[PDB]
Design a protein around this ligand. Sequence first.
Ligand SMILES: COc1cc(OC)c(Cl)c(N2Cc3cnc(NC4CCCCC4)nc3N([C@H]3CCN(C(=O)/C=C/CN(C)C)C3)C2=O)c1Cl
Length: 276
Amino acid sequence: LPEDPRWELPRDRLVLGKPLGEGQVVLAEAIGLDKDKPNRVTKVAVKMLKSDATEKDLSDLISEMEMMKMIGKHKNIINLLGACTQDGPLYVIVEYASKGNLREYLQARRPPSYNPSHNPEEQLSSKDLVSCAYQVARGMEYLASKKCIHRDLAARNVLVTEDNVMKIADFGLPVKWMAPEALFDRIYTHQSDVWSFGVLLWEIFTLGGSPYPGVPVEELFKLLKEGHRMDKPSNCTNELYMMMRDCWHAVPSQRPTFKQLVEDLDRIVALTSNQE
Ligand SMILES: COc1cc(OC)c(Cl)c(N2Cc3cnc(NC4CCCCC4)nc3N([C@H]3CCN(C(=O)/C=C/CN(C)C)C3)C2=O)c1Cl
């Protein structure tokens, strides 16, 4: 594989740590990732091919990496940090998110709807929830501006850092998150991503609720054509419900853009107190 000096990090500068999940992702420590601070260690996530991996697996991993190079940096996406491509197997180094995906993060913060965790965490304010939504919309607005269409936007594909920064995941590569047009015609656009975001908003305000609970997949597209839409979560403002519903406009052209959603969420965040 051709070397790329803009991203290469010597292999011995990376201390492989524990599994993070399934190629596969391990936690690691990078020594001197910032060339200005060569004695600093930074926790990172690393992706590499699985044990019984194919040629297709390899070139997808490369495509993902090359795509990540082009998209550029934004604080609300999982950014590329480097790669080990030479002295052995391919490693792709990206930012680490210690607090899990948003779906788990939220569930684990439910009041003791059911809390599956034996290790529960502290309650989130109303302002925190809106601000989570705002950050995710910022992520997507940036991705949309670089002409990237996600296709599987959902709370499970948002990750949360140690500092509670929301970061879009796997943006360079389930039916209950798809716009109808994607579901039927396999037509994915920025507008279908906006649909997916509405579902993601509903997850936020159900603290990780499963969408369309009890509805079988088979039925769902029909129900959707007939104008079926999820009910408002028990604890969600009418305003934020309207945003969900706008995201779920049957006509893709009539949905708001991520640009507009960011603006709207910015206003709502500033209008929601830390105490309400
Ligand atoms: C090219 O490499 C990547 C490209 C990416 O998007 C463009 C992403 Cl999102 C990733 N990441 C980076 C990443 C960063 N931090 C974490 N933290 C874990 C969160 C899950 C709990 C422990 C820490 N994970 C990353 N992973 C995956 C690894 C597993 N992930 C999950 O959400 C797993 C959920 C399963 N539950 C039951 C624990 C996210 C990734 O796949 C990686 Cl490694």
